[PDB]
Design a protein around this ligand. Structure first.
Ligand SMILES: [Cl-]
Lengths: 233, 237
């Protein structure tokens, strides 16, 4: 019965300003850092061991992983980073707060986005304040023109995250390697929806806790044998 | 030049504080060693250095130095490759002893040989040794063949198992134009330097690389260094 472990990073610096970060590379707030320390301790106390870790190219996820590996004394483990585990690309809303967003786009469009699985946000246009910061970052230089989003619905995020699951994480699990994935709410949502065969409405209702190891027990077909469980007190 | 290569040797370890031989023991950085890695990463920030792939050992003093550097230069997203072949020199049965216990147990004639000799090993680390199961039975070495796991290493041994990684995994990256950072240990970095500069056994045993200092190489199309190694930072350091 394979064991798989997910962890979602905690509060960021832009949460403290209630700003949409998306692909903006906000660091953890001091408290999000503390959350990751606690998640680490909870894996230490339970005696968890891994053989390989996956994360995004965003530092709130990476620092969460680093904190956990420090806590469980497995700093030596192989680490693989991919943009395909990044947060959902919130396009033109990147950097705005909720008030600014409602003023610019309307309460109507806002409710549509909050409820919808396949309606993207506005694209990040070249005049956007963070257009260069994100879409001209080196770390994305290898992506083709069609892979680099200017915005993403949840469906888009999941559609680009699941190829990485199948391509690099599934082979490790098949070999018996114990996997730890440190990433973001929306990419992990993709993983959860695929593992559990959830519906659109279901996954959009699922909200993953932060800083808490999420444990999956998988059968030989990598199908969950029971619902996800959490680690801690 | 054709290529830029940066090396960095980690600072003080927790066992440097007890004057104990570390080798493959996975001692963490002391607070001063952590501070040194911060200063080196800052010197890389201020010079605006960029990397595309990082190599390091499987020892947390090297790894943590690398993490601190990547943090300082806002490049935590870079691919990181860890390998035992960049590990510190394995000090065999001397692991855990201080200088005085080593002299008492082994004698002045023997330590004198051990300090001036490129290719005489320390005593092997036997199963009765207090750190044998901590090191040799660490699951992180469980994929090494029997002949690869050392019980002890001369400097020549360390260099001998470091150079194949340099040749097969690092050199292809350099030749692809990728800008490499290597965060490792004095004796493994010594291997890389001796191969890069064609230094003699004598010259490499007299070369002590500064800790916490970015070491910059400019290499030609044949990965030959075009000038002496350079250190980045305030003149003070
Ligand atoms: Cl890493």
């Amino acid at each position: 019965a394979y064991k798989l472990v997910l962890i979602r990073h905690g509060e960021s610096a832009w949460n403290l300003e209630n700003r949409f970060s998306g692909w903006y590379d906000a660091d953890l707030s001091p408290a999000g850092h503390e959350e990751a320390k606690r998640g680490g301790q909870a894996l230490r106390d339970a005696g968890y061991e891994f053989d390989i870790c996956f994360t995004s190219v965003q530092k709130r996820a990476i620092r969460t992983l680093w904190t956990v590996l420090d806590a469980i004394d497995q700093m030596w483990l192989p680490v693989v980073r991919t943009w395909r585990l990044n947060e959902r690309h919130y396009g033109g809303l990147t950097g705005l707060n909720k008030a600014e967003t409602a003023a610019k786009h309307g309460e109507a469009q806002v409710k549509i986005w909050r409820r919808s699985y396949d309606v993207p946000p506005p694209p990040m246009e070249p005049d956007h304040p963070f257009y260069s910061n994100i879409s001209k970052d080196r770390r994305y230089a290898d992506l083709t023109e069609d892979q680099l989003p200017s915005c993403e619905s949840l469906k888009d995020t999941i559609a680009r995250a699941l190829p990485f699951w199948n391509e690099e994480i599934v082979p490790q699990i098949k070999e018996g390697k114990r996997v730890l994935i440190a990433a973001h709410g929306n990419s992990l949502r993709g993983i959860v929806k695929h593992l559990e065969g959830l519906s659109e409405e279901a996954i959009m209702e699922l909200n993953l806790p932060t800083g808490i190891p999420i444990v999956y027990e998988l059968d030989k077909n990598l199908k969950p044998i029971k619902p996800m469980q959490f680690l801690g007190d």
